Design an enzyme around this catalytic site. Structure first.
Site, short mmCIF file in Angstrom:
data_model
loop_
_atom_site.label_atom_id
_atom_site.label_comp_id
_atom_site.label_asym_id
_atom_site.label_seq_id
_atom_site.Cartn_x
_atom_site.Cartn_y
_atom_site.Cartn_z
N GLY A 149 1.22 -1.22 0.04
CA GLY A 149 0.03 0.07 0.47
C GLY A 149 0.87 2.05 0.13
O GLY A 149 0.03 2.61 -0.07
N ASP A 198 4.26 -3.12 3.14
CA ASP A 198 5.23 -2.52 1.86
C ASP A 198 6.50 -3.00 2.47
O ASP A 198 7.11 -3.68 4.24
CB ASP A 198 5.31 -1.29 1.46
CG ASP A 198 5.53 -1.29 -0.39
OD1 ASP A 198 6.33 -1.12 0.11
OD2 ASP A 198 5.40 -1.40 -0.89
N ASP A 226 7.40 -8.88 2.71
CA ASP A 226 7.82 -8.41 1.96
C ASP A 226 6.99 -10.21 0.74
O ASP A 226 6.74 -11.06 1.99
CB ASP A 226 9.02 -9.16 1.86
CG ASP A 226 9.57 -9.60 0.63
OD1 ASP A 226 9.29 -10.14 -0.19
OD2 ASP A 226 10.93 -9.65 -0.33
N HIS A 267 0.22 -5.91 -11.49
CA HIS A 267 1.10 -5.11 -12.86
C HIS A 267 2.69 -5.27 -12.93
O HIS A 267 2.81 -4.56 -14.03
CB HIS A 267 0.41 -3.99 -13.79
CG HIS A 267 1.16 -2.68 -12.57
ND1 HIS A 267 0.84 -0.76 -13.13
CD2 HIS A 267 2.23 -2.53 -11.40
CE1 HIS A 267 1.04 -0.26 -12.47
NE2 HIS A 267 2.05 -0.86 -11.27
C1 LIG Z 1 3.24 0.41 -8.09
S1 LIG Z 1 3.77 0.44 -6.03
C2 LIG Z 1 1.65 0.81 -5.78
C3 LIG Z 1 1.35 1.19 -4.59
C4 LIG Z 1 0.11 1.33 -3.65
N1 LIG Z 1 -1.17 0.05 -3.84
C5 LIG Z 1 -0.61 2.16 -5.19
O1 LIG Z 1 -1.30 3.04 -5.88
O2 LIG Z 1 -0.32 3.44 -5.03
C6 LIG Z 1 4.03 -1.05 -5.64
C7 LIG Z 1 4.36 -0.98 -4.45
O3 LIG Z 1 4.93 -2.62 -3.92
C8 LIG Z 1 6.36 -2.16 -3.06
N2 LIG Z 1 6.63 -3.32 -3.59
C9 LIG Z 1 8.01 -4.01 -4.23
N3 LIG Z 1 8.42 -5.70 -3.98
C10 LIG Z 1 7.63 -5.31 -2.85
C11 LIG Z 1 7.23 -7.34 -2.34
N4 LIG Z 1 8.38 -8.01 -2.80
N5 LIG Z 1 7.17 -6.95 -1.32
C12 LIG Z 1 6.56 -6.10 -0.35
N6 LIG Z 1 6.11 -5.37 -1.73
C13 LIG Z 1 6.67 -4.86 -2.54
C14 LIG Z 1 6.97 -0.70 -3.66
O4 LIG Z 1 7.78 -0.69 -3.01
C15 LIG Z 1 5.73 0.06 -4.27
O5 LIG Z 1 4.86 0.09 -3.44
#
Ligand SMILES: C[S@@+](CC[C@H](N)C(=O)[O-])C[C@H]1O[C@@H](n2cnc3c(N)ncnc32)[C@H](O)[C@@H]1O
Ligand SMILES: C[S@@+](CC[C@H](N)C(=O)[O-])C[C@H]1O[C@@H](n2cnc3c(N)ncnc32)[C@H](O)[C@@H]1O
Lengths: 396, 396
Positions: free
Chosen positions: B235, B260, B283, B304
């Site tokens: 999030g 996150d 994670d 995505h």
């Molecule tokens: C494109 S952002 C979208 C965030 C939010 N849900 C939004 O729509 O504004 C993708 C998010 O996924 C998180 N992320 C990437 N790899 C991850 C992982 N292995 N485990 C948990 N979160 C992760 C990133 O830190 C980032 O905040």
């Protein structure tokens, strides 16, 4: 609220269109104004904040065009508007069908291709234009070697706190291609497989350079004996002198030489010998001009590759050595960049050159280049509405 | 000859404009058609061969915008249209005046700035739009980290003879940034100085995502006791759940968690605690979902970033572990890409993701992702003319 702006921009499009469609071939000024008001309309429809996303659209669009072109999609697809499926395109080019489908989304909504149906695509004349000789020579070389560096102009200048550290051998090209110390031509010619693609790009002439700007017949004829000689310095393919020999055939047994670096002379030597011009291997940064007293030393789209110092003065000095004070003249043929009201055509050429340490010059820029090299300006030759002019110089 | 085409395209611009200006907020379809016919007009004025030069213009334009933005030109220039000289801009930003003048040629002829006079420039609302919160968060990160890779999609796929070798850890991003093996987030978060810029880009919401698409009030209320919990998985900033808590305040003492990675939780933890949501370091590729029986596990603009396999299934499996069969649901909130008629907005998002191994998914793509993870589709929630939908899933 935004409707009021759209309506006014539409009005100005209709007004500039009616003006354009009743001018006489003021046609070029009415044409640019029509284009500018048409582009305003696109931006006004988008609104300021969504139009700032256009850079991200433009980047993936260029990336897709380049991938589609290099992978053979343009060649495989039928010319004339007949349609073809993602499956059949993939089968004949080897490009992954999944990738291809995703790439086509950048070039069908407005992009030059047409989405006929689900996973079904057709050429339009705007996509076929990339198969044309000038585009097909220019776009692959730019896209494989120049676009990368251009995008890294920011990173290069960041290294110097936005100061101008750009040289011919230390620049966004050397950063992107990791070749510090090599000018762009040195690095490209290093791999012989690049020489044919690169020489074809040097031959691309989308704007169709006007060669009747200068009176070659009148000046080449008055040259008696040994003076009757033209040196196309960095003349590459030779098309510059082919035009000159086609603008002045009321001639004597004139000597027409095209000089260039060894790989370029090797690529074109037989074609050039065949039209009665003699090829010469010459490096205007390592050698003095090896042809003396010639009537004209001609420089087309060469000096936009080099800054005033050191290379600009060193070219002029190296051919200064071979000149006769009152029978030889230097002709610099290049874009003349206005001090105001430049177009995207000035900008893409100048800023692409910024990547390799070159630059398109203003009139006042040419003045310094001449002064710094102790030369007097005889005349600027420009046919307005022509981007190029010819700077005619002489030893003073 | 070309005049006839211009005239017809102008007619279709006027026709689409009149249609747009008398539809009701069919407004979105009339708006896209107006934009498409306005863009056709630009291309028709240019003609096929000169329009193929637009890629080179677009590249230097993006390069100049990025350099001007990073060097402080946008911030230094006065808002509201008052003019400023190249000298004064250079003095206040440190950017070389010579470079600046050459860069401004890409962004004044049509570009978002205005050339007031010789070496004299002014903001317009189209250039000031880059100082806006969504653009200012998105454009620098894209331009410094994503544009480069996107242009190297061609080079990546060339290495595999145009086959799809793209993964989350082997892709045009890892090629361009020389970080083979690192996903995009790992590489960026490695340098803490990137976390604030990157988290702000993740917060950019130009399209203003519709959060009233799903009925959060009705479903969160019926959750009794421990079921009354929402997990905003990846999030980030938390704005997704701020919207949900603002669409359903007829509530109990509901538990709202945002999960996150550690750097992102650290950047926002205090702001999130302050609005009664609890931050959790999690994670979804290394751990099972650590919150059991929650009413909803919510995924916005996360899937995505990851292909179906391996990461897509592993996220779903890792939260499958924590779910209740008949009280928990998974909500996937993302773009739904049409099988035909996609826009440049679909294309720039999908193709930018291609660089890091992500992808925007079609309806049928979501179906496989669910099937492959043994889940049944409850309902697709889409408010047509909205690019995003919500894929509602359950264990079958
Ligand atoms: C494109 S952002 C979208 C965030 C939010 N849900 C939004 O729509 O504004 C993708 C998010 O996924 C998180 N992320 C990437 N790899 C991850 C992982 N292995 N485990 C948990 N979160 C992760 C990133 O830190 C980032 O905040
Ligand atoms: C942009 S092309 C212009 C060629 C031609 N005059 C025209 O207008 O089509 C520049 C040419 O300069 C040549 N060149 C680059 N460095 C050179 C050098 N050091 N000495 C001689 N020629 C050089 C290149 O080989 C290339 O053919």
């Amino acid at each position: 609220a935004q409707k009021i702006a759209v309506q006014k921009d539409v009005d100005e499009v209709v007004a500039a269109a009616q003006r354009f469609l009743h001018g006489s071939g003021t046609s070029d000024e009415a044409k640019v104004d029509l284009q500018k008001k048409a582009s305003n309309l696109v931006q006004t429809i988008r609104g300021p904040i969504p139009a700032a996303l256009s850079s991200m659209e433009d980047i993936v669009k260029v990336a897709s065009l380049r991938t589609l072109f290099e992978a053979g999609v343009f060649h495989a697809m039928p010319k004339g508007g007949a349609s073809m499926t993602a499956s059949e395109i993939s089968a004949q080019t080897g490009l992954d069908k999944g990738i291809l489908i995703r790439l086509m989304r950048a070039v069908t909504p407005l992009g030059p291709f047409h989405e006929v149906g689900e996973e079904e695509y057709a050429h339009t004349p705007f996509s076929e234009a990339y198969l044309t000789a000038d585009i097909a020579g220019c776009f692959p070389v730019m896209s494989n070697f120049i676009f990368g560096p251009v995008l890294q102009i920011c990173d290069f200048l960041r290294q110097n706190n936005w100061k101008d550290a750009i040289t011919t051998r230390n620049n966004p090209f050397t950063l992107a291609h990791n070749c510090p110390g090599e000018t762009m031509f040195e690095h490209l010619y290093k791999n012989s497989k690049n020489v044919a693609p690169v020489t074809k790009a040097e031959a691309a002439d989308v704007d169709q350079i006007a060669m009747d700007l200068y009176p070659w017949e009148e000046r080449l004829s008055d040259a008696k004996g040994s003076n009757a000689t033209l040196v196309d310095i960095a003349g590459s393919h030779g098309n510059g002198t082919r035009a000159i020999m086609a603008l002045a055939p009321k001639l004597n047994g004139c000597r027409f030489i095209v000089q260039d670096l060894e790989p370029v002379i090797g690529e074109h030597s037989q074609a050039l010998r065949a039209e009665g011009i003699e090829p010469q291997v010459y490096d205007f940064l390592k050698q003095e001009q090896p042809v003396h007293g010639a009537s004209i030393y001609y420089f087309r789209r060469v000096f936009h590759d080099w800054p005033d110092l050191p290379e600009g003065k060193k070219i002029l000095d190296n051919t200064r050595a071979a000149m006769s004070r009152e029978h030889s003249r230097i002709l610099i043929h290049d874009i003349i960049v206005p001090e105001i009201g430049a177009t995207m055509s000035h900008a893409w050429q100048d800023l692409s050159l910024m990547a390799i340490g070159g630059m398109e010059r203003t009139e006042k820029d040419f003045a310094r280049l001449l002064d710094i090299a102790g030369l007097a300006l005889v005349k600027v030759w420009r046919k307005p509405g022509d981007m190029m002019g010819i700077i005619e110089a002489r030893l003073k």
